[PDB]
Design a protein around this ligand. Structure first.
Ligand SMILES: Nc1ncnc2c1ncn2[C@@H]1O[C@H](COP(=O)(O)OP(=O)(O)O)[C@@H](O)[C@H]1O
Ligand SMILES: Nc1ncnc2c1ncn2[C@@H]1O[C@H](COP(=O)(O)OP(=O)(O)O)[C@@H](O)[C@H]1O
Ligand SMILES: Nc1ncnc2c1ncn2[C@@H]1O[C@H](COP(=O)(O)OP(=O)(O)O)[C@@H](O)[C@H]1O
Ligand SMILES: Nc1ncnc2c1ncn2[C@@H]1O[C@H](COP(=O)(O)OP(=O)(O)O)[C@@H](O)[C@H]1O
Ligand SMILES: [Mg+2]
Ligand SMILES: [Mg+2]
Ligand SMILES: [Mg+2]
Ligand SMILES: [Mg+2]
Lengths: 518, 49, 197, 534, 526, 57
């Protein structure tokens, strides 16, 4: 007889947290895998969202239980570190906690569970790395297969043939493949435009803008010289309080005339450089493009796009080699960008786009125009393309590849069962729980595919024990097979990060024993 | 008062000013106590009595 | 009515007395007892202010700008210097006396009190024997006031300025002590009865 | 309890007073007894906060903030009273605090006791005015007896032991008695540093009582100078300045600006460049004027801008900005400097001197304070209070206020009566003797006054666990037998009953004010025989 | 009679007056409630709480810090408010002990209720408690050890103190890692106690062991458009100028002319003034320019044409830390470059952490300010890691200030309790019976530490008491196996500052709560 | 110093009882003696009773 444990609220809190986490996991289990389906979410305001993304689903369903909130943060962290696996990570976390339930019931301490889970995590990282194979960024087929695998789960999977090569080109265009250790997906601009179908999505090497052209009649420009203007083409205005006091009738005519002359001198200094396309930054506190200035620019045959945003400036410069000019004195020819074409293209009466294509200095930037028949399908196409880009980013970070179809989860389950049998004690039960908990992703893949989960997972375990460690659930044949023949591959980083973040979140939730209402 | 501020007095004019007398005939005693306090400054209780 | 103290601690001052009035910085640098002071009673705002509310300065030169700044300062300093040259060691104004004037008088070892109430000013006038001045340009000994002693003392949590020793005084100030606002108010009413009698 | 209850001898409406039906009234002996009940409730609340073994009260305000205190004036001010006689008792305590700064609980206990005795006298049928007049007679007798048995202490700066004993007596009943002598010493040194001996005045504005959570109560100290809740303007300025020549300024280190509505017109590029150069030269001229005066430190009241801050740093002129008017005044007074309104008027003679100006940290907080000290003859002073919570800090502030007020009262009149209830017992004996020699009906009122004066020793005994009646009777008998009006209640159980030997010391003005205020308010309460209210 | 239970109620509707026993009852129950709440977080095996605010934002915190827990709860009991403020002041004074001071105060008040029931006056109790506090202070001060002289042993004491401070927190998983982090970060301050110099950036993602202390500095600000992104051998000007339509401070200044031509001349003059400002800047010979304020398009263009990296919108904290890390002077005037000291770092690049880019200063000159990147799976994990790191850094700063150390694991409390017991059994009267209660509370501290693990608290505290009675003044709880051991060897050491502050603040708050015999509440403002 | 008397409700109850008793005594003090007067008492039902008897009152 040890310590009576006079208090039961810590255990009640542990069980409540575990129940909430398992509820979240069991709620999103259906959105896992190629045979997984989407969820519609109508916000309180009425904003509808169809999605297959775990992070999106959890962020959009206003979860209230603390443990469920923590799983939301977990999925967001997975979205940050890998951008793919935001459903697998939540399912793994929920399963680890659901196993902690019976462990606690057996009478093991949460600290022992936490430490044994850390042990299982380290052994599992070892196991996954052993399973992994290195990858060369030159392996375009491997990159295409990673992207296709990432897209198989989403509504845009019949369009994988189109959106995987784009998702590989974009990333391979915005990084130096020899030196790159990561990727900034802000180099990849995505432009959602209603209309057409998802088969109309496009990869624009140049620049795309939603801002409208101000000139009428000048919509297309070949051999385009482009200038960024951070100053205002309007009557002069000092930053101090300025007035123009008239005391004679002549000064009125003089005021109008001198304003005309100021504006004309500005537009002439612009024309003299050879500029035929003019991007004007957005200007509050002063008119950036007066009607006089527009008149003169149009007469001088210059396309004008104003209302450019102060956050798109670095992107536009990175793209078309322009240099932003804030004083007319510094507006010269070396501060321009040469583009083989600049056109305002129409999209079947569904809007207009300014496309600056062709560039003498196309610097590590690309744009993806996402088309679609509905706002919902466009939004989910954007999310899926982001997942594919993030998979390529994981591949760039860690040059290692792992098979899919639940092969890593089954191999993990098996080898950690062996590890548990070797680490006899009370850690043995916890490590065996960790193993059988991770054996839940294959079960989910099977259930969603429409197979018998028990038989499928037993066959998978048996073949992995025989030695087929690259064996998984072939939803095309309907059973088990070598999953590399179906070309289901994913970056090792995804599985590794999922495991790490799930184990840390589980340990955090296990270190909790009370809830207060501040 | 309604504001809760107390006044403590032996002065009859003060006491009657503070009483919210509304009777038209009894207002006359308040008035003559005021008149006494004005013209003399003493006798305010004696006048009313 | 100064809360605190006994009825026998109440007193009459053959002169005038009133409570300290919202002093600025330097008032503690000022002295607090004068043994034959001359008293300047004024209706004058002594502080840096817009010379007039409908007044607008217009300059097109930084030299004129600096001249205008120094001109405001010289306006104030000339008012204060006239007050200082009148010989008055105590200065009372029905209107505010700013921190600049406060520190000026503190440096000249003079006493200043602003926002003095009109009734206390008229009592100080009738007691000390001067006249209240809206202008500081004719500060003669005929318009200055005088007492044998001026002091600032503590009376039951408040600070009070006492002008005492006025032989020509047609004024007196009752200072009533007691343990409650209504105690002192009924004391005042009793004394009003006695005074009218 | 109603304004008018007739409605007419003829059936017609009888409306005399507005809302007479909603209004109330209490008249006569029941009004007197209601007053006595309210006053007795207040006094019985307060009597347990009396003496060294007195306990504190935990006051909670409208917004839920907590205040733990033993100060009767603070208690009755924080108390949400509705009864008008209890409001009068709050006013009584406030009056004792205003005039004296000590006794705020004794006055209330004594007034409650006087009214409790008047209750029995009214039961026996004496006119409340006769009771009040007997109370006045006995109060005069007791006041003269206090003047008679009083002692005197030396208020010099050489031997401060009597003043330290007085301050220790004042602070015996407060939570800061853990640092009893340290607190007494710093209250004494504070008032003696800031006290006009010739005038016999003590301006408490010259005593800055500052509190900062952290540290220990033992860390509370007296700074002969000033402390400010500010830091140097630039983070790269030095945090310490020794032998600091200080320029105190109420001019913002900014380009000049007229108070009158002004418009400076720029009409040409030459005007614009002239304006630019004017601004530059103004900043340079300000810093150069401060440097040529010889100052090593500047202290402005109105804050300044980036150019001025960096020029100060470059020119090795540590500077404080946004200092308040009162602390600016205290800094001038302490350092011997003169407050300057503009830079042109700054000279080496208008500067103050402090042998140390330092920036002080407070652990893991990010909060900084500026200490100015080592002045030559600082006529200003600061008490910096430390402690483990804001409740004990606020209690320490008010306790030290009590000690300072007591030293002030000694400087005003050095005469001293001995406490522990000894003065009350002696006054009760004197009043009893004179009542014996009095043949009028007020004999009873004076005996009641004596029995009321004896409530303070009884309260001390009760709070100290002793038997009230036993202890008081033995010490009274000893007082009458061996003539020693310094015999009182051994609250601390030092063995001896001699308060002159235990150095338990009160101010004569304090006891006299207690007696006078209690009697005057009891008189005004007995004079009330009719209450009206909605 | 009584203020409340009198034939007349003397109070406004909504007020209240709890009398002697009722007041002590509500005070003791409130204080003991606070203490029972905040324990179970005490010690290595302490567990965390979910705060779960109830506003419409519903913030969610997972904390083991007693100060944080008490700050973030709605308390309405006055004695509980006293204890809450006590823990806040502990967190202000030092950065650790906020749960030990609260538990100690609550245990003292529990013993005080017991004694009041034993019919002892709450002044005899305060007397004995003050004597016991003196005895405990002197015993602690005699037990304290100092190693500030010996650099190696001082380093070891710092590592031990950081480990002991982190043991209770979520970082005990990677304790040997975060200990080194915190120690290196507090030694990079070179004796200063400025904890603002240590910046902590919480980056969602990554493991908790992926956290690190940057060898240089990191900044979450942007670089201009046409300006470099990499700079080797960087000469840096740290500034606080306007560089944003910077107008002459003359505010009555207005441009009043009769010609738009003149307006244009004046506009060109403004631009020329900005250009001359930028030129004065460049005459310092710099490659990087950091400004606390904004940098508008025209000065951005000028710095780009000059080949200068111009970082804008750093804040007061940013420029202070940058001056500390590089050696520069925050400037606002550039007419005397010979007097403005520049900052230096071997390299300034832009790095990725999670999905965000940051300015990385490597090879810095001084390094007297620091950046710690905290990685984690949840925002709750990150906030709790920041709080735990703050704890450890505060304690190490306070130790660098005062190198005195004091053994932990209940050794210190047991030693103080032994001294209090000696005083009590040599003291006559009921003050001895109150000293014994003081000692019982001091002992209940390690009792609770052991309870939270699951050990035979009674057996272990009895063993400890016997050891400290025999003379093993370094015996404490060994929480690995659940036995007693030598804290000097196991490296469980605390800062004398933190232990003394715990003791004194707890005793003071218990005293102030015990002095109360009446609680007079005023009608809620509602 | 004896026993602290940690409880004040016994004393409060004693004082409340004493106050009530004294209130009754002071209420009927006027109905005592040859010069004492009577009290009218209107019951809740409206039964009127004029009396000088203490027990009846
Ligand atoms: N064609 C496929 N056949 C079998 N398994 C697949 C296939 N495509 C993806 N998967 C598996 O589906 C899982 C991920 O699907 P998804 O719904 O996107 O979840 P997550 O958000 O966790 O990536 C991984 O285990 C991956 O190996
Ligand atoms: N050491 C002591 N021994 C005996 N009596 C004391 C002692 N200290 C204070 N007293 C008494 O306790 C009474 C109350 O003092 P205190 O509570 O400090 O302020 P107040 O007079 O405002 O209640 C005084 O009348 C004094 O006689
Ligand atoms: N490794 C350890 N072994 C034994 N005792 C420890 C250890 N680490 C910390 N402690 C003890 O735990 C207590 C501090 O617990 P903690 O939860 O940090 O509360 P606090 O906020 O009061 O510091 C101290 O008594 C300390 O000595
Ligand atoms: N004529 C009288 N003169 C004086 N006292 C009287 C006279 N008649 C009755 N008493 C006194 O009045 C008291 C009783 O009066 P009463 O009102 O009947 O009270 P109770 O109900 O107690 O008898 C007794 O003390 C009695 O001696
Ligand atoms: Mg996926
Ligand atoms: Mg009269
Ligand atoms: Mg006192
Ligand atoms: Mg700790």
């Amino acid at each position: 007889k040890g310590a009576y444990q006079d208090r039961d609220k810590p255990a009640q809190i542990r069980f409540s947290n575990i129940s909430a986490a398992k509820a979240v996991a069991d709620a999103i289990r259906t959105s896992l895998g190629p045979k997984g389906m989407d969820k519609m979410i109508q916000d309180g305001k009425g904003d509808v969202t169809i999605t297959n993304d775990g992070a999106t689903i959890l962020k959009q369903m206003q979860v209230l239980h603390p443990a469920a909130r923590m799983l939301v943060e977990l999925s967001k962290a997975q979205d940050i570190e890998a951008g793919d696996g935001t459903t697998s990570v939540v399912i793994i976390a929920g399963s680890l906690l659901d196993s902690c339930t019976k462990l606690l019931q057996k009478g093991i301490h949460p600290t022992i569970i936490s430490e044994s889970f850390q042990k299982a995590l380290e052994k599992g990282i070892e196991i996954l790395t052993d399973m992994s194979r290195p990858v060369e960024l030159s392996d375009r087929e491997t990159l295409l297969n990673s992207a296709t695998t990432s897209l198989n789960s989403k509504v845009v999977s019949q369009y994988s043939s189109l959106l995987s090569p784009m998702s590989v080109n974009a990333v391979m265009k915005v990084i130096d493949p020899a030196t790159a250790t990561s990727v900034d997906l802000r180099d990849i601009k995505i432009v959602k435009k209603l209309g057409g179908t998802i088969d109309d999505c496009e990869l624009v090497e140049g620049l795309v803008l939603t801002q409208k052209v101000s000139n009428s009649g000048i919509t297309r420009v070949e051999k385009a010289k482009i200038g960024l203007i951070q100053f205002c083409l309007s009557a002069p205005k000092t930053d101090m309080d300025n007035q123009i006091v008239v005391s004679d009738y002549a000064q009125m005519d003089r005021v109008l005339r001198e304003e005309r002359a100021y504006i004309l001198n500005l537009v002439k200094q612009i024309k003299k450089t050879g500029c035929n396309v003019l991007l004007i930054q957005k200007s509050i506190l002063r008119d950036a493009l007066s009607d006089l200035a527009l008149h003169f620019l149009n007469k001088m045959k210059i396309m004008v796009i104003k209302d450019i945003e102060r956050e798109d400036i670095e992107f536009i410069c990175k793209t078309i080699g322009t240099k932003p000019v804030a004083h007319i004195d510094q507006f010269t020819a070396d501060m321009l960008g040469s583009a083989e074409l600049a056109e305002e293209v129409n999209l079947n009466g569904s809007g207009k786009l300014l496309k600056i294509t062709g560039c003498a200095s196309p610097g590590k930037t690309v744009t993806i125009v996402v088309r679609g028949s509905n706002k919902l399908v466009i939004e989910e196409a954007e999310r899926s393309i982001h997942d594919a880009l993030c998979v390529i980013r994981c591949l760039v970070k860690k040059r290692a590849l792992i098979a899919g179809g639940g092969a890593p989860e089954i191999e993990l389950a098996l080898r950690l069962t062996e590890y548990s049998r070797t680490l006899s004690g009370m850690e043995s039960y916890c490590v065996r729980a960790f193993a059988d908990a991770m054996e839940v992703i294959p079960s989910t893949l099977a259930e969603n595919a429409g197979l018998n989960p028990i038989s499928t997972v037993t066959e998978l375990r048996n073949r992995h024990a025989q030695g087929e460690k690259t064996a998984g659930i072939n939803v095309r044949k309907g059973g088990i097979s070598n999953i590399l023949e179906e070309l289901v591959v994913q970056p090792l980083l995804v599985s590794v990060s999922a495991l790490t973040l799930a184990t840390e979140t589980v340990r955090s939730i296990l270190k909790i024993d009370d809830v207060v209402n501040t | 008062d309604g504001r809760g501020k107390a006044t403590i007095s032996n002065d009859g004019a003060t006491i009657l000013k503070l009483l919210d007398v509304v009777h038209p005939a009894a207002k006359t005693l308040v008035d003559i106590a005021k008149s006494q306090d004005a013209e003399v400054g003493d006798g305010t209780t004696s006048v009313t009595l | 009515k100064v809360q605190g103290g006994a009825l026998e601690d109440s007193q009459l001052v053959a002169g005038v007395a009133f409570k300290k009035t919202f002093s600025y910085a330097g008032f503690e640098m000022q002295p607090k007892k004068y043994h034959n002071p001359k008293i300047a009673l004024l209706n004058v705002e002594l502080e840096l202010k817009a010379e007039k509310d409908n007044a607008e300065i217009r300059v097109h030169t930084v030299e004129d700008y600096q001249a205008i700044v120094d001109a405001e300062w010289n306006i104030l300093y000339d008012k204060l210097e006239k007050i200082h040259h009148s010989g008055a060691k105590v200065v009372l104004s029905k209107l505010p006396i700013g921190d600049v004037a406060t520190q000026y008088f503190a440096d000249r070892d003079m006493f200043c009190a602003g926002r003095v109430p009109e009734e206390d000013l008229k009592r100080t006038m009738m007691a000390c024997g001067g006249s209240i001045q809206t202008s500081v340009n004719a500060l003669s000994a005929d318009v200055l006031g005088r007492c044998q002693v001026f002091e600032e003392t503590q009376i039951g949590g408040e600070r009070y300025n006492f002008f005492t020793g006025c032989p020509k005084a047609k004024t007196c100030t009752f200072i009533l002590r007691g343990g409650a606002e209504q105690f002192m108010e009924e004391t005042e009413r009793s004394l009003h009865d006695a005074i009218m009698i | 309890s109603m304004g008018t209850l007739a409605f007419d001898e003829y059936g017609r409406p009888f409306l005399i007073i507005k809302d007479q039906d909603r209004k109330s009234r209490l008249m006569g002996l029941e009004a007197l007894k209601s007053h006595i009940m309210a006053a007795k409730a207040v006094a019985n609340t307060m009597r347990t906060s009396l003496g060294p073994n007195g306990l504190d009260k935990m006051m909670v305000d409208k917004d839920g903030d907590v205040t733990v205190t033993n100060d009767g004036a603070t208690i009755l001010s924080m108390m949400d009273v509705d009864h008008q006689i209890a409001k009068l008792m709050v006013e009584l305590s406030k009056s004792q605090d205003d005039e004296i700064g000590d006794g705020t609980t004794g006055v209330v206990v004594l007034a409650g006791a006087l009214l409790e005795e008047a209750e029995q006298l009214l039961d026996r049928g004496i006119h409340p005015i006769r009771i009040a007049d007997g109370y006045e007679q006995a109060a005069r007798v007791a006041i003269e007896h206090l003047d008679k048995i009083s002692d005197s202490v030396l208020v010099d700066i050489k031997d401060t032991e009597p003043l330290i004993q007085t301050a220790k007596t004042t602070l015996g009943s407060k939570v800061v008695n853990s640092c009893h002598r340290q607190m007494a010493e710093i209250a004494v040194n504070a008032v003696l540093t800031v006290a006009d001996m010739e005038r016999r005045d003590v301006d408490f504005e010259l005593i800055k009582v500052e509190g900062k959570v952290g540290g220990r109560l033992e860390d509370t100290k007296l700074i002969k100078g000033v402390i400010v809740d500010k830091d140097f303007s630039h983070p790269q300025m030095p945090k310490k300045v020794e032998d600091a020549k200080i320029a105190i300024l109420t001019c913002p280190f900014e380009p000049p600006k007229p108070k009158t509505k002004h418009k400076l017109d720029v009409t040409s590029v030459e005007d614009y460049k002239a304006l630019q150069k004017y601004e530059k030269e103004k900043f340079e001229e300000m810093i150069q004027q401060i440097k040529e005066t010889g100052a090593n430190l500047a202290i402005c009241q109105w804050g300044f801008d980036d150019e001025a801050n960096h020029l100060l740093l470059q020119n090795n002129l540590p500077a404080v900005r946004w200092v308040g008017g009162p602390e600016i005044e205290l800094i001038a007074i302490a350092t011997g400097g003169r407050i300057v309104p503009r830079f042109s008027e700054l000279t080496a003679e208008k500067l103050g001197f402090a042998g140390l100006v330092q920036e002080i940290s407070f652990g893991t907080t990010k909060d900084k304070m500026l200490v100015i000290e080592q002045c030559k003859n600082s006529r200003a002073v600061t008490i910096f209070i430390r402690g483990g919570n804001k409740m004990i800090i606020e209690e320490a502030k008010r306790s030290l206020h009590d000690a300072l007020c007591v030293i002030r009262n000694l400087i005003r009149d050095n005469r001293v009566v001995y406490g522990g209830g000894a003065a009350e017992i002696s006054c009760a004996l004197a009043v009893s003797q004179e009542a014996d020699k009095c043949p009028t009906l007020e004999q009873y009122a004076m005996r009641a006054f004596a029995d009321a004066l004896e409530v303070i020793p009884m309260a001390l005994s009760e709070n100290s666990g002793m038997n009230p009646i036993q202890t008081m009777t033995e010490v009274r008998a000893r007082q009458v037998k061996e003539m020693n009006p310094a015999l009182g209640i051994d609250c601390l159980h030092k063995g001896t009953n001699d308060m002159k030997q235990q150095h338990v010391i009160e101010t004569l003005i304090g006891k006299k004010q207690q007696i006078s205020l209690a009697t005057q308010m009891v008189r005004m309460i007995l004079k009330i025989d009719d209450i009206r209210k909605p | 009679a009584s203020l409340s239970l009198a034939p007349v109620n003397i109070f406004k509707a909504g007020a209240d007056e709890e009398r002697a026993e009722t007041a002590r009852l509500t005070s003791f129950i409130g204080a003991i409630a606070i203490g029972d709440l905040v324990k179970s977080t005490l010690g290595p095996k302490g567990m965390d709480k979910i705060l779960l605010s109830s506003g419409r934002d519903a913030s969610l915190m997972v904390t083991n810090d007693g100060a944080t827990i008490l700050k973030n709860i709605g308390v309405d009991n006055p004695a509980a408010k006293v204890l809450v403020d006590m823990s806040r002041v502990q967190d202000d004074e030092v950065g650790d002990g906020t749960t030990s001071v609260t538990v100690l105060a609550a245990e003292l008040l529990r013993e005080a209720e017991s004694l009041i029931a034993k019919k002892i006056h709450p002044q005899t109790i305060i007397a004995g408690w003050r004597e016991a506090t003196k005895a405990a202070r002197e015993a602690l001060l005699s037990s304290a050890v100092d190693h500030g002289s010996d650099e190696v042993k001082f380093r070891q004491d710092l590592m031990n103190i950081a480990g002991t401070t982190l043991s209770s927190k979520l970082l005990t998983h990677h304790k040997d890692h975060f200990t080194k982090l915190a120690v290196e970060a507090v030694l990079r301050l070179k004796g200063s106690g400025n904890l603002e110099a240590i910046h902590i950036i919480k980056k969602l993602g990554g493991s908790l062991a992926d956290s690190y202390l940057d060898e240089g500095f990191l900044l979450d600000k942007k670089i201009g458009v046409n300006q470099p992104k990499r700079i080797e051998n960087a000469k840096i000007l740290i500034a606080n100028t306007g560089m944003d339509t910077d107008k002459i401070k003359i505010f009555g200044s207005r441009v009043r002319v009769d010609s738009t031509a003149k307006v244009a001349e004046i506009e060109h003059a403004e631009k020329e003034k900005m250009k001359e400002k930028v030129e004065r800047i460049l005459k310092h010979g710099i490659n990087c320019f950091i400004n606390r304020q904004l940098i508008y398009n025209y000065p951005e263009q000028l710095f780009g044409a000059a080949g200068v990296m111009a970082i804008e919108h750093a804040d007061f904290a940013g420029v202070e830390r940058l001056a500390l890390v590089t050696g520069g002077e925050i400037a606002s005037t550039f007419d005397h470059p010979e007097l403005v000291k520049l900052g230096s770092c071997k390299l300034i690049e832009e790095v990725m952490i999670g999905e965000d880019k940051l300015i990385h200063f490597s090879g810095v000159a001084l390094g007297e300010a620091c950046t710690i990147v905290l990685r984690g799976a949840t925002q709750q994990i990150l906030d709790e890691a920041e709080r735990s790191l703050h704890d450890a850094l505060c304690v190490l700063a306070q130790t660098v200030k005062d190198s005195r150390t004091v053994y932990g694991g209940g050794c210190s409390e047991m030693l103080m309790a032994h001294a209090v017991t000696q005083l009590a059994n040599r003291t006559p009267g009921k003050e001895a019976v109150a000293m014994e209660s003081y000692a019982k509370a001091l002992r209940m501290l390690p009792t609770i530490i052991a309870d939270n693990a699951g050990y035979d608290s009674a057996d272990l505290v009895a063993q400890l008491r016997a050891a400290h009675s025999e003379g093993n003044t370094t015996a404490g709880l060994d929480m690995r196996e659940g036995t007693i051991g030598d804290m000097a060897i196991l490296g469980i050491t605390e800062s004398f500052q933190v232990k003394r502050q715990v003791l004194l603040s707890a005793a003071e708050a218990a005293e102030v709560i015990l002095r109360v015999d009446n609680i007079i509440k005023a009608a809620p403002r509602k």
